[model samples]
Target: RNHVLILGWSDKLGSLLKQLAIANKSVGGGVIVVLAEKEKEEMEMDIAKLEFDFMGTSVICRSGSPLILADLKKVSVSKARAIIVLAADENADQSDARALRVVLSLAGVKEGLRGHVVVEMSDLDNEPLVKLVGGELIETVVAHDVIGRLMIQCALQPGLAQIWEDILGFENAEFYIKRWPELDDLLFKDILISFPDAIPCGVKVAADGGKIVINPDDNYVLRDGDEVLVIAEDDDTYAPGPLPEVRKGYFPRIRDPPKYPEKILFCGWRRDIDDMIMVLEAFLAPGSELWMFNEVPEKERERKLAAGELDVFGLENIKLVHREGNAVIRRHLESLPLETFDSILILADESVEDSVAHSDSRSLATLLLIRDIQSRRLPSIIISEILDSRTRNLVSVSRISDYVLSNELVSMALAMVAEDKQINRVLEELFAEEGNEMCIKPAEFYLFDQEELCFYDIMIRGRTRKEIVIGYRLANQERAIINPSEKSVPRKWSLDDVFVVLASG
Candidate 1:
């Protein structure tokens, strides 16, 4: 079949390539050629391992320089269905524009070529140039902006990603939505009965000021124009209709105050511990108890604790409880008042070891802890910061709901700065706050049940709340609220499709 060319060989590109390869295999085997500037030998060896690791998947890997025409002499670039430029150039944005031009010059654009070109660049300033070349550019910085916002959302609403994945039906999941018949004009509690297993994450209101609302309470009324958001096994079980369009925005609002946690568990500590503490203080109530389970020496721990007050992140109301033991040991975990904490965070150490063994050890330890928690049915919601991709996969299997990849996040930020000096200003302002809050809440609170509201109205309402509602949790068959369509009906909710509203924030 056709090929998908992925440029760049680092961890980010490599991970993405691996995922794409696996995703494509379900349809059929497809060729994937890689282009890197250096470490050609190492890249070849790494790709070979990937190919072996992903056996039964139709993926072929090759190494070459995208800048060298001679390197491309044999391969048919013109036949490639998609080209993904995932490399980071100091020149970032301009390099991609130049590279795409070179590819067109050498290979000559096929007339009426329907194939797409998606590039991950550091800057969006080059968006005009990218479009001029008939290519799509995913500003990684912008994407990370979205990612960071989601991270905050996870902090506020634990286990959010799990709900997203469960509904989406991804082998390695995300989120999706669907429409049900009786779902119209039905209260949320009644809707829950229809999809018992699926979680009701939000509701999309079609009325004036229509918005996606998250974690709605029982009193929240459902109207004829409302499209409910449920995380379930199937979309049709929730509603028998088409889905609503997903939005992309950041609204860091706390709609429901978090239940006060008796104990705050810190699984792993790092140099950024002080900053982490500050974030906790701003969001958490005063005099919250803190429990740290780490191997750091007492002196170092005290030093870290002392530095907490100096943090510019937010407030500082953390009571420390140090447990000097390895988290991997079940005995050590059992020793803690596990019943106390409602939330847990596994932060990454800034002095991360380059040693493979050490990395694997930490990851395995975290995985063990996760397994133990799940087996014990502990209520604590877990969050982790993992460095190595290998460890990420292991943790994913344990269903650790949320994870923050420090290096990738930081590198993405750097790439953004390199690409556009302008966005950097916005980023600095965004992250510098004591409440550097960025979150994605559901879009139901702003829309009335039956009033027709455009997507723009919902966005405006979210903005007024000092938060923005972006994206949604779609329902499918396994989680339907009404059976009017008899499992085959699909009704999409759009501004034009129904009478909508713009509910006030």
Candidate 2:
């Protein structure tokens, strides 16, 4: 019997489809069939590019909808174990009702079928209506609200978000702590010796208002609902818990007043640049400098950097330095004192490489530029813009510090919205708080002394610290992939490979 089926094609559908494709590569086998109302051609092309096949022990994509279920009556939809309803959108108001109708149609069949119905909607008010139709409804706008709050948190905390990513195995790092079932009634500090790598970031209680004191407290009991926050390498040592509660008046403050210690160099610019510039302004302080490398009209750069356009909270202190030259050329980059810049944001024209070679070529350009600047040994971070995953994977890892695939993040966010409406609230807490940002860190960092730990041991310890140790990083590998559990070990990860940890920011 097929394990999962999708009922619609939308932004969330695309994201979930990508995740399923990636997951199919690791699992023994599963069937995925998509039902689409429109844009069949485009969606097929997208799936085909990802290398999915309709016939295999692996992934598949089909074009059809619940309303057209009669067209697929022979396909045994009733036999599938899970059906995901993902057709909701801004223009579709009756999506909940339509989705429920489809589920009801399948429910009435006496062909001996069973499957869970997961539906998505933009409005939470309609959730009760969906439940009545035997469908699980999820809200997307609420999910976006959560993501937006996280971004805001990142803007406030420069490296904190990255830390959260590390703990979550997103940045190739992990967190773990020792677990002791015997310490059932011990104090939190008394059990600290069991988990040496664990950091007491916070504690969880039974209720939202439960009192379980964390950090700066010498003594706190290990109650039934207590959860500790620790940043460690990838390992799950304790039983996992739900998302942490975000209490009021508990936000971490930057003692240094958040430095705008600016030395930013942008390799190129785009429409996205306008938005990023506004974000940067909020973090920048006086005496900060920004260099833009572009041959575009000077007026355009000025328009983006205009004072009134910035999002500075207190004061705008950004100095624009325009460098006119081709980013593809090495000479243009060598001409500047590259050591002066702390970070470089590269924006390549999608049209230049026909969107096919753009990301790789752009990354290669940055590699060459960095090769010239390496002698200076400046602590520079590179943020590149890439759309396609294939290009992102092909690019030489030497130059890029961070690759921002806006499409992927946006897709993942939509998928989360489709999966569960409450997830939006979870995301809000994850991305809230600067200097405490959400991120996926690698698993290797969880090992004791960098060698004495298995992936399962790491996961066990991670739970004790309240960190969600989802996946691990292959030793020395650039990519950090998600691993759902400890028992499912992948061949790619060896004793030498490092684990990652995921955390809230």
Candidate 3:
């Protein structure tokens, strides 16, 4: 049986450990987490709170320093199918040093490690050292930078954060790389439309060193040994067959793209604010205005401006206004023009000691204030960054468009990259500046003048435009249904419904 070995622990370990257990359940193996003897009781208590049955897979905890050879032998590292090394400290340099130590130790094992080793490092500078020491055997995840990049990407595109969470979160459909030799000669687009349940996003070409090519050309032909990348609830749910016949005498109507001036509000502040602003500058309309409401000192703001850390392009068209007030304050929020803004973003404050709890508290309070002020006229959309998952449900009833759980998303990304390094490239392409990215567009683009349309009809319309329609977000329900079955009954679409598509903008 192939077992998983996890070294060290942190706040993210609980989520990562549970995902590991669930993923391994199908393969019939177990997980072993190594920690110091002094922290064994705490770790055990945390594991107990998970309440997840080990199922046929057992979870073992070994009490010893992972740096020691004896401790490595205790968990039988040679038999482990995967090894995950988490940052042991909060300090960037120290945490990365500890992770590097563990990586080197694992590389020195005489019997040799059996499977992939994934290490989480806080600094990118340490990546070169890790690569030199472990080479292709190790996959390094830059925790801080990845989280910052995701925050920026989500800030620029509404509903994009939810899409990524659905793909990576353990509770929902996830991406899997599966080889399909039986469909070697099929066209990529044909294969994409053939699946009624699963959504094919890309293919891993064996001829290209297992490189992932997402949303390839329609005419691209699949080859032998190529692995199809798909998002599905389960591995067996993918049942590809012939496409359904379209009804005769039905022509899809097209609509013009809508354009409007944009006004965005930023509530609260964090280290990644500048990076998010840079990305927003690139996406927002020319005449859009970005309002920042925070309590940072004027002197400090000027210092940041002088240092060029907050410098953004297109300053003439995109007005940047900074207000000196706390977003959580009711009086300050009352004075602002919340109704005029198109979108509101709440960021977690990273300056506090307990950043997770503190940031969530401020965000929750700000959300409550906004909810109270806009009972009649709510903002078009609201995006918030929540650090802890426990606090997410408490604020769910609020009129917020999306909540990006920073830690959970990062943990899931780490797990995905650990499984397949090629996923890093796929994620990069999705968040890149010039490639196809996920966008939410009005349903009118697909449904046009029709009162109702089948999911396959919408797919056909999207394919005609060179865009892939994966799912739709119901306006009334505020929920996203991704990769719906095409053979299912046709459903009525309202003007408020939004189509989630992969397009080049």
Candidate 4:
């Protein structure tokens, strides 16, 4: 019997299935992918191009519409452990409706099916359809909406996209949930210090419908069946050992938060522009100002805002201005107050119908122009969204602060949910404003004017302030080192390093 069954075959589905194949190698599960008859040869050719070895797992491709019961029988969906439903079309609304129809058909067989179903909805508005089906085994992932939120987040906090990629990507340390009965009575504070390699970011209480508590308070107690959300090189690397003795005479000092005048420059526009602006508004200061440059007509922009297409109003003290021009042109780039802005964002043209390469080429052109302008002075942090992962190295030549690869990130998120559905909830809570979200702060805030201190010392200090320090970024480095080792030899920290912390508000 196949261990997993997949319905639909699209670009995202192909990426997700590859990741699933890599992950399934250890657990020993074969994958059966079901799609339309026309996609059979194309999917087979695509799967053959995957660079990584699939280990010993067997991957079979079948041709059939998921809405038909005969096709489900061909793949033995009833006996499969997990079934993943992917979007069939590129159009957002059409994909959601297509995925919904597949789920509705799947629900028809719920009485005889033993496997769990995971659906990828392109829009959040269609989420209600999943709940209406009334099945505990159904899980819906809103890919487009999640990516929009992530793009805005990475723009606000540099090095965040890299951190998430490290945790979510198959190449580096990834997140895992483990339940240890021995830790039933321990506080989360103790758990944070007990693990030498793994960093516990959240807890899942099994008794409370598996509610996830991200960066929970130090005094939060653990109980039986509670799972710890941790990041480690591998699942075996998370085995807990005896706790180390606590250091004496250490009290974390509190300091005022860092302040910066809000001046942002946004290049290009897409469907999610308004969502990004709304999210930015929530975090920006009272006098924040935003400048947008794109070829979109002023009349169309006004129509979008006026017709509630953007779903935002009442800017208060915040100022938003839209200019009509090609951001890649030298004249347009020079016309903007580039030197005055604290940060710049280059948005991918998702409205383009040609291809990912075409959209990314436009983003790369604008990024190069922006980087050239900052060559003489201290470079303003620039964040860009790239549609194609292959264009990452090309954009990196410009040395942008961060790059958000929408397709790759969304694929990883889908693969994660397929691996363990509970993680979807944890991610939603982490990304939402109500919970403790990840933030990057100046190292001086925790260093307290000291020239050097052990990484573990900073971790304890952050805990004292009701914040969790998972990693630090050196001024000269491009990526954040999450959960650095706390050696007995004592690692020295420099003043130029930045601390990566989990904080509320």
Best by TM-score: 4
Model 3: per-residue Cα lDDT over 25-44, one tens digit each: 66674555555544667767
TM-score of each: 0.48, 0.50, 0.84, 0.89
Ranking by lDDT: 4, 3, 2, 1
Which of candidates 1 and 3 is the stronger one according to TM-score? Answer: 3
lDDT of 3 at 73: 82
All-Cα superposition RMSD per candidate: 12.5, 10.5, 3.7, 3.1
Tens-place lDDT digits, model 2, residues 1-505: 6666677765445556654443343354466777666566776677666544332444445556576647445446677665666645333336556665766665655564555555554333445665665533223332222323333334333343343343322123233233334555566534433343333334445455543222313355665555454443333433433222211112122222345466777666543355455555555666787688776777765664464345434436776677787777777777877767776656654235333344446645765566566665455565555544445556525332443333345445443433333334344344533222244343334433334343444554554444545455466655554443333231333456544444532
Stretches > 4 Å off in candidate 3: 32-38, 52-54, 108-110, 121-135, 143-163, 243-261, 302-317, 353-359, 373-380, 398-406, 451-454, 474-478, 486-496
Candidate 2 is scored at a TM of 0.50
User: On residues 331-421, what C-alpha lDDT tens digit does candidate 4 reach at each position?
Assistant: 8787787898777888876566234447777888887788787774454668777755556655554334546455667778877877777
Highest-scoring model, lDDT: 4
The C-alpha stretches of model 1 lying farther than 4 A from their native spots are 1-10, 16-39, 44-153, 159-262, 305-315, 349-356, 377-379, 398-436, 440-444, 447-457, 463-467, 474-505
Greater-lDDT candidate between 2 and 4: 4
lDDT pick, better of 2 and 3 = 3
Error of 4 at 345 (Å): 2.3
**Model 4 TM-score (2 dp):** 0.89
